[PDB]
Design a binder for this molecule. Structure first.
Ligand SMILES: Nc1ncnc2c1ncn2[C@@H]1O[C@H](COP(=O)(O)OP(=O)(O)NP(=O)(O)O)[C@@H](O)[C@H]1O
Ligand SMILES: O=C(c1ccc(F)c(F)c1Nc1ccc(I)cc1F)N1CC(O)([C@@H]2CCCCN2)C1
Ligand SMILES: [Mg+2]
Length: 292
């Protein structure tokens, strides 16, 4: 069925962050609850047609690790992406409630991010371009899915960009120039996992007394200079398994050719161990964020 603006009904607002605002909506003719993201763009009619045309490949992006898509359309200065409503929200939101996400749970997430990225790469020859906790979605069925990946190049271009400034998940190479590709997503995942594991954006790293308590903010140039020139972030020892520690280290190597790739991580000790693990993520999620 084709989706049109007048067939939806707002339920609640899910967020923004930015350019694009996302609401929880009821598609009146199906009865389905969807999450509709509207992106306001001052764009010519020919290239907004290109954006919609390119977005149609989302109908072919079906994977347990990729957020479901319903349809894409243009309304009144806004392009709409109607997708599966993830009743658990983003990992950024669950981290706010959790304070800290456990290692076992982070193993289940890591498995989903690698499998999600492998899917987009193998099946669709596309890179995520923005792997961070808010673009990693969860639900009460215990599902961990990716969204906000760069399926449309023209949309990628049209939405720009640097809306940070105390948190950048950009790899040192992407921060430094045009010399980036799929390896950038590895870094972003690596950084995201350290954040969720420790309970805060890991730059600047925490001191002796800061880590003791757990277990003013930074200027844009200070943070970016840290990323590109200072040694990469690490997981604190003792509190985390050597397997997780090595895994994040492999992800956060500043040299993208030295950095581990999806292939290597997929067979990493940490992943192999998490795959064996019997983890009720669904039950953990609902009890920590307040659902079931
Ligand atoms: N399909 C969905 N189901 C449930 N919640 C969603 C869905 N999509 C987006 N959201 C929520 O909407 C919030 C804001 O959406 P979004 O415009 O993507 O901002 P952001 O992820 O914080 N930054 P960015 O994705 O880089 O533009 C996110 O934190 C999610 O919690
Ligand atoms: O929402 C998006 C987005 C950007 C490009 C693109 F091609 C899309 F399809 C996008 N949305 C999207 C993709 C797959 C599903 I399933 C649902 C979706 F809503 N962007 C990427 C974003 O995270 C920002 C844009 C600005 C720079 C940093 N990343 C937000
Ligand atoms: Mg997002």
């Amino acid at each position: 069925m084709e989706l049109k603006d007048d067939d939806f009904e707002k339920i609640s607002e899910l967020g923004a962050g930015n350019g694009g605002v996302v609401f929880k909506v009821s598609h009146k003719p199906s009865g389905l609850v969807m999450a509709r993201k509207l992106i306001h763009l001052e764009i010519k009619p020919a290239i907004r047609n290109q954006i919609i045309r390119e977005l149609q490949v989302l109908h072919e992006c079906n994977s347990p690790y990729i957020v479901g898509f319903y349809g894409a359309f243009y309304s009144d200065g806004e392009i709409s992406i109607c997708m599966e409503h993830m009743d658990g929200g983003s990992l950024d939101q669950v981290l706010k409630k959790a304070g800290r996400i456990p290692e076992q749970i982070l193993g289940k997430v890591s498995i989903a991010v690698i499998k999600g990225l492998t899917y987009l790469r193998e099946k669709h020859k596309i890179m995520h371009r923005d792997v961070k906790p808010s673009n990693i979605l969860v639900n009460s069925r215990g599902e961990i899915k990716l969204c906000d990946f760069g399926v449309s190049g023209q949309l990628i271009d049209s939405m720009a960009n640097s809306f940070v400034g105390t948190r950048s998940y950009m790899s040192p190479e992407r921060l430094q120039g045009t010399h980036y590709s799929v390896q950038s997503d590895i870094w972003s995942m690596g950084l995201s996992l350290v954040e969720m594991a420790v309970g805060r954006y890991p730059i600047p790293p925490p001191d002796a007394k800061e880590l003791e308590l757990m277990f003013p903010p930074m200027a844009i140039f200070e943070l970016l200079d840290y990323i590109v020139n200072e040694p990469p972030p690490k997981l604190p020892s003792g509190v985390f398994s050597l397997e997780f520690q090595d895994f994040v280290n492999k992800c956060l190597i500043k040299n993208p050719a030295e950095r581990a790739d999806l292939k290597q991580l997929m067979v990493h000790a940490f992943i192999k161990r998490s795959d064996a693990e019997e983890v009720d993520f669904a039950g953990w999620l609902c009890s920590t964020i307040g659902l079931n």
